[PDB]
Amino acid sequence: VKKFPEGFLWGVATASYQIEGSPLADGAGMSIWHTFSHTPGNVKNGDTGDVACDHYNRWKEDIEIIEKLGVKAYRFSISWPRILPEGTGRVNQKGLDFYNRIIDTLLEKGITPFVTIYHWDLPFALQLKGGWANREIADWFAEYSRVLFENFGDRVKNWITLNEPWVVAIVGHLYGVHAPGMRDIYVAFRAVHNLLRAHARAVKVFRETVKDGKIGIVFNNGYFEPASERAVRFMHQFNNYPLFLNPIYRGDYPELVLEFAREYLPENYKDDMSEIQEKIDFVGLNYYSGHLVKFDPAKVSFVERDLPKTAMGWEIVPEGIYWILKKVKEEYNPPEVYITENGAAFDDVVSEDGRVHDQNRIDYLKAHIGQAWKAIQEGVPLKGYFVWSLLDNFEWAEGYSKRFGIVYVDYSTQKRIVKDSGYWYSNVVKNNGLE
Known about the structure:
Pathway: Glycan metabolism; cellulose degradation. The chain has helices spanning 16-19, 32-37, 55-68, 80-83, 93-108, 124-127, 137-152, 165-173, 185-209, 231-239, 242-250, 255-261, 273-276, 319-332, 359-377, 420-430; strands spanning 2-3, 9-13, 73-77, 112-118, 158-163, 214-226, 282-295, 300-303, 337-342, 382-388, 407-410, 415-418, 433-434. The chain is α/β, with parallel strands linked by helices.
């Protein structure tokens, strides 16, 4: 058996654009993901978030599912354009009403809300002004964050500024695969820098408005290994939490990042570093996959390995989640850590018996929860673990073709079908560990 600490937070996680649909309902502004997905060629099969899981209408049922499964924490995000349709200035009361109802319902049912302030749906109106490329986004983000704190901070006490800022900057502005779909390395590193400045401004406002809350930040991470017996050191520093935590904790970007990217950073970027060091309460780590890597004349290539893979083609390496937990304590020793996302996509099907027998997902989850347990036994201050995702949903540029849910969604009807993995995870939470 592997029992977790008393009060350990077992959660599930979603994001606004991925599940809600109704992106323009009730006076919401357009987001960059609305315009991106409505641009031909950007998203698989031309999928958009127009409907998604229709959570904008079915939110109560979904929460009742969380309650029914006995899950103790719900990580969800707020759509900035629902709250400020032009990004700054005017507040949309109906946007506030939507999240107020979700928040009150969670607390009613004894579920702890973990709110992601930014999970990629920037207001289109701000993108017209440069979005993450514009230094002024630190002010815009501050103003947005303030509205949320003032309206919800009385009940929500666990906050996350940014989800996966590396993805936002690099995948959104260098690779062009995510909104806003740009391919400019100088823009992308300006976005890295501004993401930090905006995160830090929001934390500052938080200290002034929610004196009894906790606030953190979420990073994507991969477990990188060398093909033979440094490129691994680069990938860790660039793609993992150090890109952001070295500034936050140490006041500069990591060494190998500066070697690669100093030319792409703003000229006096160091002048922002003391403000960026604003104290945070916890670090969220997302983890999905491992990668074998080797030098290649970013001077790094991935080497495909055997290993079981998910429908994403992501290699399943459970010891990565232990490694990254250990590594984060070793390098920056944050007071609290959460695994804010962990999960897998598989080609689920509803059997004739009306069940989704996703043993593959159960095995994936079980293996990773075990490794996180291990990190805990060896001193890592892990306070929680969130499965991505409660529901199958819009998987960004993959559209609906990738199902991550522990609850199956039949998009033709919007029917929810709890998967075997969901029943399994429910037992894990009730028992507060593996058995």
